[PDB]
Design a binder for this molecule. Sequence first.
Ligand SMILES: C[C@@H]1O[C@H](O)[C@@H](O)[C@H](O)[C@@H]1O
Ligand SMILES: C[C@@H]1O[C@H](O)[C@@H](O)[C@H](O)[C@@H]1O
Lengths: 310, 310
Amino acid sequence: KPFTLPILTLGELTNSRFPLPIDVLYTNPNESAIVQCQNGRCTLDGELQGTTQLLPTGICAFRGKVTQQVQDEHRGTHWNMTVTNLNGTPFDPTEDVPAPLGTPDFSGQIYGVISQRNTNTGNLPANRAHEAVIATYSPKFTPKLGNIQFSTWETQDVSSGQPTKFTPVGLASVDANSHFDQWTLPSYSGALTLNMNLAPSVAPVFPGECLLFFRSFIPLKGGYGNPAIDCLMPQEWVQHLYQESAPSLSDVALVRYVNPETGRTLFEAKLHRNGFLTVARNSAGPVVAPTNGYFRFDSWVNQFYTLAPM
Amino acid sequence: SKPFTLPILTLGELTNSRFPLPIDVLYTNPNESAIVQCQNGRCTLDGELQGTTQLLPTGICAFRGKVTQQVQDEHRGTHWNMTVTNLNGTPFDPTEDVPAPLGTPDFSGQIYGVISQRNTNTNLPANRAHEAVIATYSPKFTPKLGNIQFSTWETQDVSSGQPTKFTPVGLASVDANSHFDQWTLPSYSGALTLNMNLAPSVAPVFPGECLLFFRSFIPLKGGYGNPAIDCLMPQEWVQHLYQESAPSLSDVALVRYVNPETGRTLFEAKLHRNGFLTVARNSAGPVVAPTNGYFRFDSWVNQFYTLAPM
Ligand SMILES: C[C@@H]1O[C@H](O)[C@@H](O)[C@H](O)[C@@H]1O
Ligand SMILES: C[C@@H]1O[C@H](O)[C@@H](O)[C@H](O)[C@@H]1O
């Protein structure tokens, strides 16, 4: 079965690490951090890795039940919630995943909405929703143990023992104390514990090459900043690769970024077996190109192939 | 002739095309008196997008634009006038042959979500976000005219002339005065004006058949209720069909809902050319079936094909 990519343009793609549209292509050659995100991880022959699952609605989502309001040193009203798998089944910590699929894969204060639909009940359940923040760096962020903590501005109107959904919206803050670092993984089982079953780190191996990211700008609840989330492949590529399961005929696919209005190749890239892109670029920042561009699979090459400079 | 295919995503791997929600169940309602003419999640089998349908899961019921004016409500809450652009940021052209900007909500109700802003000017821009409600039945909901109104509990902290995003989360209410009706279209240009360029209504033509929906339950900000949103096809089908653009070889594709664990067919359905499903079922409610089940295209049939009763 021949390898293929979706023919979706950049303006028709969404981020695999946060529910956002892809805004720009982006490089940062001098990135010192180890790049090892856990969402949007999929091999070219369709093997999902890390915490990656298929739903755009599942990315950085949680499902579970509030247990109790809890004390926390930090501002706001805090709540413990047990988390299940996103499909409602119990999370089994013995499964070989880092955390429930969909769990956020970066450090920061993730802003969103907690909503509840009560179990009990014209035989219709009571509901409530409020803004909420999940600090993924918190010692109480233990999704691998089956529970996390969120904070609200709302002081009271959150119910214990009721089905609870977290819908992510953005970040609460990117100030110094909010610890936003998109390449720092949460400690999924809590402070001082080793993460396990991780998707592997990614890096360029060839000289002059750097990672190419699909970048989205993420909303902020307040403060100054223009934060972004970089994913290795968009969610639609994850969905496509997963379904096709085409054999990878080498370690590296040659892809061309093409303008379909002109038919011209804007640049070429290496699409690696583990599911990430590299380019021959010597600068950091956005790739300035029309958002009607798309990557076209041209052929299987090898690690020794030299890319045309961008 | 390029063969017609459906994605091999299971029910637990599909998302709603009319609101950013996972698919929860398949659902019928034979006695539905309303005309079914939703405008999101509309796509022909040969890949023609219709109504307000666009490809991004993040675009469904989303808005982008700028706030122009604050108006206080006579009783409670603050209202904000917003000019809307296309989701890709370009000016919305009301002379284009669409009902409204793509992604525009296609039902009557109070849609609850978060309005977020990132200022243009500054050396980092200021941000804010607040819970917001868009009443799509309001005389002020005129997205086809390039402007809508949203309300906030927040009384002051929304900025004029700054890039504004609406992230949908659920419904504010489903009480009588909140006018939720998933099959009542908004008046995209206001009450006395006719909606234009609509995707056509859908219905079974043969007796004993009824529409089959992909149903998702939608969160509530408050009050009692268990509201749901029914779409004709999941967003992943829209994306798939759009890319494949396989010729339709008849008016009806016969599809089988199959259990991959046993390989057995649970039921069959008609997938109609205009992009909707019917089944031979004489009852209302969910279809009790495993969520690892999926629809498999078997053959092109004819409108007179008699479905096996469910
Ligand atoms: C930078 C400031 O952050 C705050 O949270 C906001 O409420 C203000 O409007 C402003 O954007
Ligand atoms: C396949 C590779 O071709 C390169 O040119 C050589 O330098 C390597 O040793 C290797 O043989």
